[PDB]
Design a protein around this ligand. Structure first.
Ligand SMILES: COc1ccc2c(c1)cc(C(=O)NS(=O)(=O)c1ccc(C)cc1)n2CC(=O)O
Ligand SMILES: COc1ccc2c(c1)cc(C(=O)NS(=O)(=O)c1ccc(C)cc1)n2CC(=O)O
Ligand SMILES: COc1ccc2c(c1)cc(C(=O)NS(=O)(=O)c1ccc(C)cc1)n2CC(=O)O
Lengths: 273, 289
């Protein structure tokens, strides 16, 4: 009946869904705007950019979930950013009845990433929906790196009439443009040097786009063709919702490739002509 | 937020209208109760409404929407009874303050896209021959719950499988609503209320009492064990003219992957002519009875 302990301006950690739910509700009732940054831990500058984006909403309290969908470092990083709530549930707490009711994505989940991994997105949309129901944030923050994921989440939100604002945060990148990812550490020196071709192809495309869609795609393809040991799985230009690219106007160019055993993805905004 | 006149029936079609009114009410302290229906309201629906009105400080939202996504090709969707005039008349007589009557286009502007995939219970019983039926039902109920954000939502027990799956949806997606099951309202002879009873001719209406007679016979027979309970119900169904049984099954109360213990639910579905009737009852086995 009592709200769990919450100390404002400190890092409060909760592993019970009902605790975080009760604290988030208590906080909402006192005025604060609840922001949710979902993560799977092993925090990097990309997650800090989602945190900083959430923190700048006036009156924000920031909830960072850390949950590996089937430590003290992460928490210290959150402490240093001024985050007030970490939600760190067990698999059992998230799934106390096992896998049962789930989210079935629309047919977009079968395209692109959904080729190698036909059910990956059902799993992501299920846990995102649960996290949104537990935390009930006013706004939820994702990076743009996994753009198809982001689009699928906006579809989830629209389709199930969720009241939350979905905020996409521009992808944080290394100095040479490589998109931040937990996988970059695995690249040896030759793979890491080759991997800059994804971001270089996409920026080349976004600039070639004054010359039209084919010039853009041909520019990206040429840059990827200049890289050794980059096995391109797809290179597609779509509209911003990931339907077919309209004759001109706004679009998104997406790429994925395998370098040795590591799969990399990147995407960029494209304006046609 | 549009107009809300209290102590009157306010009808909203736009999801955003009822969402705004609901959230404003909740913030001024009223607890919001949802009774989701497919219209063609009968006294069983009025019992749901009365249950909801009984919650202190309640405001009652009754939704009316014949959801196309739970029907499969065939004439079933076109055939569903629609009596909107009667429906709204009844809600006013019960003192309901909000009816939410959305259009199909306002519910499904993008057609069918993201959906709820129920657990394996949805492929059994009523779902065996209708493999997407319960995905359709839970998808609309999820939407209704997110639009209205009620404190409690009320269902009849007559569609007991559906109520169980709804409890699963609420648990599995950490929804912040209480699910309230209300005991089935019956005609004087025991027949479960249903917007499909209008399709029984006089002979079928007479024979239809067999379902509820079979179930209560089984619940009293149950002191002698599950076989006796099942056999009593089967005997009554067999004695009845023109009743074709589709299934008669005794299950644990969650209908889930656990054997029957002391407490069960006995479920029956049968066709009288073209009309499929359902009914169910609580069963206590042996000492529990
Ligand atoms: C704003 O800049 C960025 C740049 C890259 C990002 C992120 C942000 C976030 C991620 C990432 O995938 N985070 S996550 O594994 O913790 C994650 C996976 C799935 C969901 C729905 C949310 C977060 N990543 C990529 C990654 O870590 O592999
Ligand atoms: C408390 O007493 C009862 C008794 C029977 C009831 C009810 C209440 C409610 C229904 C019913 O089917 N209502 S409904 O078609 O509008 C309906 C269908 C599906 C959902 C999820 C909610 C309501 N029915 C069954 C019916 O009309 O067949
Ligand atoms: C066991 O036999 C069947 C037969 C048809 C089935 C299924 C099973 C399962 C589906 C299915 O999930 N179809 S769907 O993703 O387009 C869908 C999901 C939800 C609803 C309410 C309707 C369709 N469907 C429809 C299909 O694949 O088009």
């Amino acid at each position: 009946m009592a709200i769990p302990a919450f100390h404002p301006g400190e890092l409060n950690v909760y592993s019970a869904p009902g605790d975080v739910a009760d604290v988030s509700r208590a906080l909402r009732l006192t005025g604060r705007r609840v922001m949710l940054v979902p993560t799977m831990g092993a925090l990097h500058e990309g997650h800090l950019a989602l945190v900083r984006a959430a923190k700048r909403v006036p009156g924000s309290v920031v909830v960072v979930s850390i949950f590996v969908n089937p430590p003290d470092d992460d928490l210290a990083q959150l402490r240093a950013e001024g985050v007030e709530i970490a939600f760190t549930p067990t698999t059992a707490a998230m799934y106390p009845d096992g896998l049962r009711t789930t989210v079935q994505p629309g047919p977009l989940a079968a395209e692109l990433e959904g080729g190698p991994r036909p059910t990956h997105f059902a799993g992501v949309l299920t846990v995102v929906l649960k996290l949104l129901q537990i935390v009930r944030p006013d706004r939820v923050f994702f990076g743009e790196k996994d753009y198809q994921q982001l689009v699928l989440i906006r579809q989830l939100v629209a389709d199930f009439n969720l009241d939350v604002a979905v905020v996409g945060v521009p992808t944080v990148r290394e100095a040479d443009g490589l998109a931040m990812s937990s996988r970059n550490r695995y690249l040896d020196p030759a793979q890491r040097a080759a991997a800059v071709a994804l971001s270089a192809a996409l920026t080349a495309a976004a600039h070639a786009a004054t010359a039209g869609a084919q010039a853009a795609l041909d520019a990206a393809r040429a840059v990827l063709d200049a890289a050794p040991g980059v096995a391109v799985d797809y290179l597609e230009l779509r509209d911003i919702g990931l339907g077919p690219m309209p004759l001109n106007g706004s679009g998104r160019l997406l790429v994925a490739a395998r370098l040795g055993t590591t799969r990399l993805l990147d995407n960029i905004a494209i304006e046609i002509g």
